[PDB]
């Protein structure tokens, strides 16, 4: 009965592994462009991207909460990152190139973060 206890590392360690994965998602150009900046349906003038997605999220959100240290567990990052891909597949569906761009990013995440969560999670 190997029962692991709440070990976790810290805001700095979580960054040491999560940031790198973030770079693996930002290294892409067309797939990580609108994902690094909010949409602001007001400036955009299109009330809809925020009405169907309770949490728009964006690469600038996780990276920011990480640069400061808002969460102490790694699950908060993997949960926020996937939450970002959730909105994409939740508002873009399969009828848009954004769902495609977000698709490769996700695959590149579960593949880049696999080693991290393996020793971090
Ligand atoms: C740059 C910007 O904020 N916009 C974005 C979209 C827009 C659609 C119309 C206008 C602006 C838009 C589609 C979803 C991503 C996104 O990021």
Reported as type and span, the H/E element at residue 115 is helix 97-120
Query: Which residue, among 118, 107, 116, has the nearest Cα to 21 in the 3D structure?
Result: 116
Domain count of the fold of the chain: 1
Mutate to test the pocket of ligand 1, among 47, 49, 98 (most ligand atoms within 8 A of CB): 49
Cα 114 to Cα 39: distance, rounded to the nearest angstrom: 29
Name the residue among 16, 38, 45, 24 with its Cα closest to residue 87.
Answer: 38
Report the nearest atom of ligand 1 relative to the CA of 37.
17
Where do the H-state alpha helices sit in 1-96?
Answer: 11-26, 41-44, 59-68, 74-87
Which domain range does residue 88 map to? Answer: 1-121
Among 84, 92, 91, 97, residue whose Cα is nearest residue 56:
84
34: Cβ below 6 Å to ligand 1? yes
Helices and strands counted in the chain (H then E): 5, 0
- Residue 31 sits in a domain whose CATH number is 1.20.920.10
Question: DSSP state, 96?
Answer: S
Distance CA(21)–CA(9), nearest Å, equals 17
d(C-alpha 109, C-alpha 6), whole Å? 25
33 lines ligand 1 (CB under 6 A): no
């Amino acid at each position: 009965g190997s029962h692991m206890r709440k070990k976790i590392f810290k805001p700095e360690e979580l960054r040491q592994a999560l940031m790198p994965t973030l770079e693996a998602l930002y290294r892409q150009d067309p797939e990580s462009l609108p994902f690094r900046q909010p949409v602001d349906p007001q400036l955009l003038g299109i009330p809809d991207y925020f009405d169907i997605v309770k949490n728009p999220m964006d690469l600038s959100t996780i990276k920011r909460k990480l640069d400061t240290g808002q969460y102490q567990e790694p699950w908060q990052y993997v949960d926020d990152v996937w939450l970002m891909f959730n909105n994409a597949w939740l508002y873009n569906r399969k009828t848009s190139r954004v769902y495609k761009f977000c698709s490769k990013l996700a695959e590149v995440f579960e593949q880049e973060i696999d080693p991290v969560m393996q020793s971090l999670g």
